[PDB]
Design a binder for these strands. Structure first.
Ligand SMILES: [Mg+2]
Ligand SMILES: [Mg+2]
Ligand SMILES: [Mg+2]
Ligand SMILES: [Mg+2]
Ligand SMILES: [Mg+2]
Ligand SMILES: [Mg+2]
Ligand SMILES: [Mg+2]
Ligand SMILES: [Mg+2]
Ligand SMILES: [Mg+2]
Ligand SMILES: [Mg+2]
Ligand SMILES: [Mg+2]
Ligand SMILES: [Mg+2]
Ligand SMILES: [Mg+2]
Ligand SMILES: [Mg+2]
Ligand SMILES: [Mg+2]
Lengths: 111, 97, 109, 176, 46, 189, 26, 41
RNA sequence: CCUCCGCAUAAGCCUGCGUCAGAUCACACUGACAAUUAACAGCCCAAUAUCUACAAUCAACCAACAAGUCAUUAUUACCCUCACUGUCAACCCAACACAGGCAUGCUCAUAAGGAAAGGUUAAAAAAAGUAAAAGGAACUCGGCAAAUCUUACCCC
RNA sequence: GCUACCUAAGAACAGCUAAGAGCACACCCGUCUAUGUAGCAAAAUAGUGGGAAGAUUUAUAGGUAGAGGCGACAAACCUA
RNA sequence: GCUAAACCUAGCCCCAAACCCACUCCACCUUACUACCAGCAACCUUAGCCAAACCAUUUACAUAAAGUAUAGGCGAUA
C-alpha cells in the first residue's frame, strides 16, 4: 500500500500482511512493438517489482515469470500564461513476462 | 492622449443623508450643555491625535510615544527613520535661520 | 543551478543517484559484497479472498432508497458491546500480547 | 487471467455503458467487515478495468466511452475507506481512548513554530540515536524576533481581507 | 582569458555549500531561512 | 476555475466556455444572495418587464451564481448554428437569460404573478406559499439492471454483527491464516 | 482614468464641433 | 494621484492652433511648437 | 569537397529535430501521444582483540633517492537470497542554435562525422593568400612582417 | 564551482636523441604580428612562438574570508 | 486609415474595534521533502555615517510643570 506507514520488522516478527490494497495499476498498449509474451503495465510510483509480482498472482491469478521496471520522467517544459512550468506526472512502467507461454497480445478497444 | 472619450457616470449625491443633514449636531455641546463635555471629546479618530493639531514632526513624535509600544515591527522602524529624517530636516535644513 | 525543480533520483552524480530512490518502502539490506538479502517476511504478501458465490458488484441500482448518514461514533458501537454487559448485573488491558495493536498501530491499512 | 482488466467485448466501442448509482457510505455501513473486505477487491477489479480504458482512450485520441462511471467507483472506495476507518476509530477509542493511530507530539521546530511532529518507529531508544540527536526541536531565541514579524505579516493579510468584504458589502448596499 | 564561465556546476558541491543541512547547521544560517520564509520564497534553499 | 470567474450561460467546463474564458482573463465582476430562493428549476413563471412581457413559461436552467433564470423558448433572439462553410447554417431562437425579480412565480390555479414566502406549515415543513391567497406551490420536476449492478435486495443485507475485533483481524480469523510469531516491540519515540 | 468631469465635458463640446465641420448638416 | 491635471489637452491645442501653418515637426510636436509660436508672436 | 574531428564514459542539464496534428532566409515552436527495462554502474560490510621492516619501474640483472599507490589472524555471531536507483536527446558552462571553455578511454586517418558558395556581377577601399624582372634592408624606431636559415660579440 | 595556496586520494605525458637535458605531438602557457573593437568573443581567431618526466599539467571532493584569506610581492588574486 | 486611443474595478492605503495562529493521508535537519541501529549544543556594552560648517569629548532614538532645574571641547547640542 501507499501513503501509509509500514510496521517495522526486527528479526522474528510476523509476516507483513496487507488487507485492502491502496495502489491501483493500469494496463497499456506498448508503443514500440514489444515482444510476444511481454505485457506492459503502469505501476504507481511506490510499488516494488516483487510487490507487482505478488499483486498479479494474488488477485488476477496470472502466472507471471519475469518483471522489469523503469521510471519514466515526465516532461517539465510546459509553460503557462503565468510562465511557470507544469510537470506532467512521472510514472513507473512494468514489463511483465508471462509464464508457460501464455501469449497475450493487446486487443483492439474501440472497433 | 489623456482625455477620455465617454463622459463619466453622473455622481448622484444625496445631500439629505442621515450623516449630511445632521452634520455638526452636538457641536456646541460645551457652551450649552453647561460644559459637561468638550467638543474635542467627540472627535472619533486615531488615539494619538484626538483633539490635538500639531505638525508633521510633532505627529510622529506623539504617535511614537502613545502607540509605538504596540506598533508593528517594521512600521515602528519606518517611524523611527522618519523622526530621524524630520529632525535633520527641520532643524538643519531650510531657509530662514 | 535550478532551485524550483524537484530533487528526484535522476539528478546527482553516481553516488547521489543510487542512494535516494523513489518512495519504495524497501525490503531487505546490503551485506559485504553489495549482496542484497531480500527478507521474505518484510515483503508485503496480499490477503486476497476468493470471490465466487459473492453477491456484491461494484455498483448498486438506483431503485435502492435514499438514506441519511450515521457517522459511527465510539458511543454508538458501545451500545452493541452491551449484549453481555446487561447480563452481568469485551476488553483488552494492553496490546503487548496482541498481534494487531490499535494505538501503537501494528498493522497496515 | 488478463481479460478481467477488460470489460465484456460486447461493450467495446459502444460510447455508452449503463452503470450508475455509486456506493453511498450509508449502504456500506450495514455490511460486515468480511463483505467490505470482499467489496474492496471487486472495486479494485473494476477501477483497474476503467483505468486501462481511459489510458487507451487517450492513446487512440478518442473520448472515453463513458467517463461518468470512473468517478462513481473512486468515491465508492473512498466511502468504503471511510466506513472502515470509522469502525477502527470507533473501537480504538473503546480499547485505548486515544485518537491519532500514529503517535505524535506537539514539538516546536527550529523556526519557533509548533508542529505536529509524527513519530517514526525506531529499534533503539531515542538517547542512542546518531541521527535523531542531530535534529533540534527548540527555540534558540534569535528566532523570537522573526516569530513576531511573521505574526504581524499574518495579521496584516487578515486585516486586509476583513476590510475588503466591508467595502464590498457597502457597494452592494449602495445599489440595493 | 575569457571570463564568463565561472559556474562549473556540480551537485555535490552545490548541496554541500548551499544545502538545507548547511543552512540549519550554523545559527547564523538559520536566520537566512527565516528571512526567506518571511519574504515567502518558493525555494528556501537548494 | 479562476477567482473572480464570470458565470456564463455555457457550462463552466465546456469547450465553448474556454473559448470565452481562458485562464488569464480578469474582466470586471458582476454585482448580485439570500439562499431562500423561490425560483427552482422547472417552475412555471411569467416575465414582468422587458420584451415578451406577461407571457408564461417554464424555466429550463437556473443559475444561482448570477441570479438567472432561462425560461423556456421565450425572451429569445435568433442566431446561426453550424455554418461550417460559405453558407448559412440553420437558425435557433436562443433564449437570453432573465435576471431574478424581473420574473415572478405564477399561481397554480389563479394564474397571476405573486410573491412567495417560505412559511412553515405543521404538515412538514417548509414549502412555498403565495402572498395574495393560500395555495402552497409545490416543487415540480424503469432502470432494469446490468451485470455490474448489485440489486436492491442485497444492498440492505445488514450483514454487520458489530463485534470488537478490527477488520484486519476478522479477515484473518476467517480465511484460515495462522500466525505463530508475535510482534516484537518498537520504540516509537 | 482621471478624476475630472469638466475636462471630459469640454472635450464633448469639441468633438461634436468637429463632426459639424467634417460632415456638416444640410 | 490625487489632483492630477485632467485638461492638458486644451492647453496644448491653444498653442498648436497657432502653429498649424508651419513646417517640419513644429506644427505637431508641442516642445517644438512653443519655441516657434513664441518667436512667431 | 572537408575532417583540427568522431564514438563512449565521467561531469552537467532534465525530454530539448520520435510519431500524429497545428498555428505561423526557409518547412529544434505549440498541443496530444509515446518511450530509456540490468548483467554494466550505483546503493555495501557482526563484534572485540591481533597482525602488517623488505617500493613502483616488463621486476630480472643493474641503479637509485624524492623512500614509495594495495596483506591478516584468533575466538564468538551467522544459513534470509538478486530489492531499490541511474539508462532518452542534436545536450553542458559562457545572456544566443556564441569560431570560446570542457576530465578520461579508444580511434591517430578515419568503417564515425560533416558542407567553406542565397543568386549574380567581377569597381574602389579593406582583408586572407599566391607569383614577380633587375636590385637585395636602400624600408624602418627597429629586418616588424615575409622569405630563407644562420655568424660573432656586448649589457643584465 | 572563477582564481591564490593547501590537503586527501586519482589521472595524463607519442616519437626521436642522449639530467628542474635537447628536438618534438597530445596538453599547458600566451612572445611578436595582422584581423577583430556593439567583435565569433564583456579578451577571440589565424599564423608565429615558450614549455612539454616535472618547481609540469589536470579531473574530483575538502580547507582557509574581508579589521580577513592567500601570495615564487605584481599591492597580484579572493564569481567579469 | 493604419498604428493606436479611451474604460471601471481588480485590489490597496489609513484608522477604529478586537489580542493572532497551528494533525486529510504519507514525506521533511542525511544531499530537507529520504520507512528502519549504539555521544558535541543557547546566553557576551552595537558601531558608524551624521551635527559640531574639520575633528579628536560629545551629537535626540494625555495635557501642564518646561525646553525650566541641570549636563556640555559650558559648544554643537542634550
Ligand atoms: Mg546512452
Ligand atoms: Mg558572453
Ligand atoms: Mg559520413
Ligand atoms: Mg554573396
Ligand atoms: Mg623580385
Ligand atoms: Mg630612411
Ligand atoms: Mg636605413
Ligand atoms: Mg619575424
Ligand atoms: Mg626537460
Ligand atoms: Mg624543449
Ligand atoms: Mg603561483
Ligand atoms: Mg614592488
Ligand atoms: Mg607599486
Ligand atoms: Mg562634522
Ligand atoms: Mg575632510
Amino acid at each position: 500500500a501507499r501513503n501509509v506507514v509500514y510496521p517495522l520488522y526486527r528479526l522474528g516478527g510476523p509476516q507483513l500482511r496487507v488487507f485492502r490494497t491502496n495502489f491501483f495499476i493500469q494496463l497499456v498498449r506498448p508503443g514500440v512493438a514489444q515482444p510476444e509474451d511481454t505485457v506492459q503495465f503502469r505501476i504507481p510510483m511506490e510499488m516494488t517489482r516483487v510487490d507487482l509480482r505478488n499483486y498479479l498472482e494474488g488477485i488476477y491469478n496470472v502466472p507471471v515469470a519475469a518483471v522489469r521496471t523503469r521510471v519514466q520522467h515526465g516532461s517539465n517544459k510546459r509553460r503557462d500564461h503565468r510562465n511557470v512550468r507544469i510537470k506532467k506526472p512521472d510514472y513507473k512502467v512494468a514489463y511483465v513476462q508471462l509464464a508457460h507461454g501464455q501469449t497475450f497480445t493487446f486487443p483492439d478497444l474501440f472497433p | 492622449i489623456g482625455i477620455r472619450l465617454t463622459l463619466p457616470p453622473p455622481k448622484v449625491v444625496d445631500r439629505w443623508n442621515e450623516k449630511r443633514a445632521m452634520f455638526g449636531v452636538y457641536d456646541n455641546i460645551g457652551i450649552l450643555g453647561n460644559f459637561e463635555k468638550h467638543p474635542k471629546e467627540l472627535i472619533r479618530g486615531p488615539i494619538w491625535l484626538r483633539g490635538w493639531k500639531g505638525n508633521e514632526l510633532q505627529r510622529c513624535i506623539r504617535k511614537r510615544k502613545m502607540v509605538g509600544s504596540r506598533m508593528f515591527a517594521d512600521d515602528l522602524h519606518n517611524l523611527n527613520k522618519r523622526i530621524r529624517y524630520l529632525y535633520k530636516h527641520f532643524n538643519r535644513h531650510g531657509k530662514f535661520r | 543551478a535550478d532551485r524550483m525543480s524537484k530533487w528526484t533520483s535522476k539528478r546527482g552524480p553516481r553516488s547521489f543517484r543510487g542512494r535516494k530512490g523513489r518512495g519504495a518502502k524497501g525490503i531487505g539490506f546490503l551485506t559485504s559484497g553489495w549482496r542484497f538479502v531480500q527478507i521474505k517476511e518484510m515483503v508485503p504478501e496480499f490477503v486476497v479472498p476468493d470471490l465466487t458465490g459473492f453477491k456484491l458488484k461494484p455498483y448498486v441500482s438506483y431503485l435502492a432508497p435514499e438514506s441519511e448518514e450515521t457517522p459511527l461514533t465510539a458511543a454508538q458501537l458501545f451500545s452493541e458491546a452491551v449484549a453481555p454487559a446487561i447480563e452481568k448485573d469485551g476488553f483488552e488491558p494492553t496490546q503487548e500480547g496482541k498481534l494487531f495493536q490499535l494505538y501503537p498501530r501494528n498493522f497496515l491499512r | 487471467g488478463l481479460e478481467e482488466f477488460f470489460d465484456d467485448p460486447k461493450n467495446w466501442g459502444q460510447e455508452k455503458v449503463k452503470s450508475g448509482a455509486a456506493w453511498t457510505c450509508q449502504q456500506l455501513r450495514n455490511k460486515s467487515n468480511e463483505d467490505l473486505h470482499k467489496l474492496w477487491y471487486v472495486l479494485l477489479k473494476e477501477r483497474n478495468m476503467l483505468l486501462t480504458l481511459e489510458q487507451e482512450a487517450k492513446r487512440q485520441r478518442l473520448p472515453m466511452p463513458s467517463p461518468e462511471r470512473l468517478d462513481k467507483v473512486v468515491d465508492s472506495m473512498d466511502a468504503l475507506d471511510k466506513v472502515v476507518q470509522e469502525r477502527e476509530d470507533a473501537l480504538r477509542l473503546l480499547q485505548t481512548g486515544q485518537e491519532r493511530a500514529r503517535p505524535g507530539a506537539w514539538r516546536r521546530d527550529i523556526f519557533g513554530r509548533i508542529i505536529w511532529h509524527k513519530f517514526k518507529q525506531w529499534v533503539i531508544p531515542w538517547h542512542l540515536n546518531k541521527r535523531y540527536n542531530r535534529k533540534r526541536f527548540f527555540a534558540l531565541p534569535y528566532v523570537d524576533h522573526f516569530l513576531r514579524l511573521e505574526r504581524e505579516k499574518r495579521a496584516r493579510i487578515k486585516a486586509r481581507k476583513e476590510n475588503l468584504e466591508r467595502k464590498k458589502a457597502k457597494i452592494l448596499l449602495k445599489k440595493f | 582569458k575569457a571570463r564568463g564561465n565561472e559556474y562549473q556546476p556540480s551537485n555535490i558541491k552545490r548541496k554541500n555549500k548551499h544545502g538545507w543541512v548547511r543552512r540549519l547547521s550554523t545559527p547564523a544560517g538559520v536566520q537566512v531561512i527565516l528571512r526567506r520564509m518571511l519574504k515567502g520564497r518558493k525555494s528556501l534553499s537548494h | 476555475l479562476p477567482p473572480h470567474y464570470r458565470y456564463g450561460m455555457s457550462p463552466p467546463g465546456s469547450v465553448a466556455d474556454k473559448r470565452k474564458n481562458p485562464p488569464w482573463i480578469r474582466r470586471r465582476p458582476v454585482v448580485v444572495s439570500d439562499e431562500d430562493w423561490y425560483l427552482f428549476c422547472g417552475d412555471t413563471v411569467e416575465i414582468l418587464e422587458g420584451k415578451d412581457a406577461g407571457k408564461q413559461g417554464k424555466v429550463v436552467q437556473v443559475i444561482r451564481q448570477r441570479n438567472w433564470v432561462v425560461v423556456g423558448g421565450l425572451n429569445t433572439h435568433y442566431r446561426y448554428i453550424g455554418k461550417t462553410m460559405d453558407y448559412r447554417g440553420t437558425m435557433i431562437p436562443s433564449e437570453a437569460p432573465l435576471l431574478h425579480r424581473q420574473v415572478k412565480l405564477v399561481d397554480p390555479m389563479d394564474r397571476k404573478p405573486t410573491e412567495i414566502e417560505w412559511r412553515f406549515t405543521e404538515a412538514g415543513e417548509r414549502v412555498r406559499v403565495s402572498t395574495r391567497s393560500g395555495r402552497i406551490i409545490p416543487k415540480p420536476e424503469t432502470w432494469i439492471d446490468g451485470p455490474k449492478d448489485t440489486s436492491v435486495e442485497d444492498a440492505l443485507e445488514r450483514t454487520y454483527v458489530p463485534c470488537l475485533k478490527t477488520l484486519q483481524e476478522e479477515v484473518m480469523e476467517a480465511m484460515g491464516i495462522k500466525e505463530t510469531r508475535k510482534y516484537k516491540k518498537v520504540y516509537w519515540y | 482614468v482621471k478624476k475630472g468631469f469638466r475636462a471630459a465635458f469640454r472635450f464633448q463640446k469639441e468633438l461634436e464641433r468637429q463632426r459639424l465641420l467634417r460632415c456638416p448638416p444640410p | 494621484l490625487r489632483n492630477r491635471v485632467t485638461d492638458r489637452y486644451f492647453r496644448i491645442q491653444e498653442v498648436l492652433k497657432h502653429a498649424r501653418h508651419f513646417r517640419g515637426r513644429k506644427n505637431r510636436c508641442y516642445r517644438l511648437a512653443v519655441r516657434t509660436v513664441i518667436r512667431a508672436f
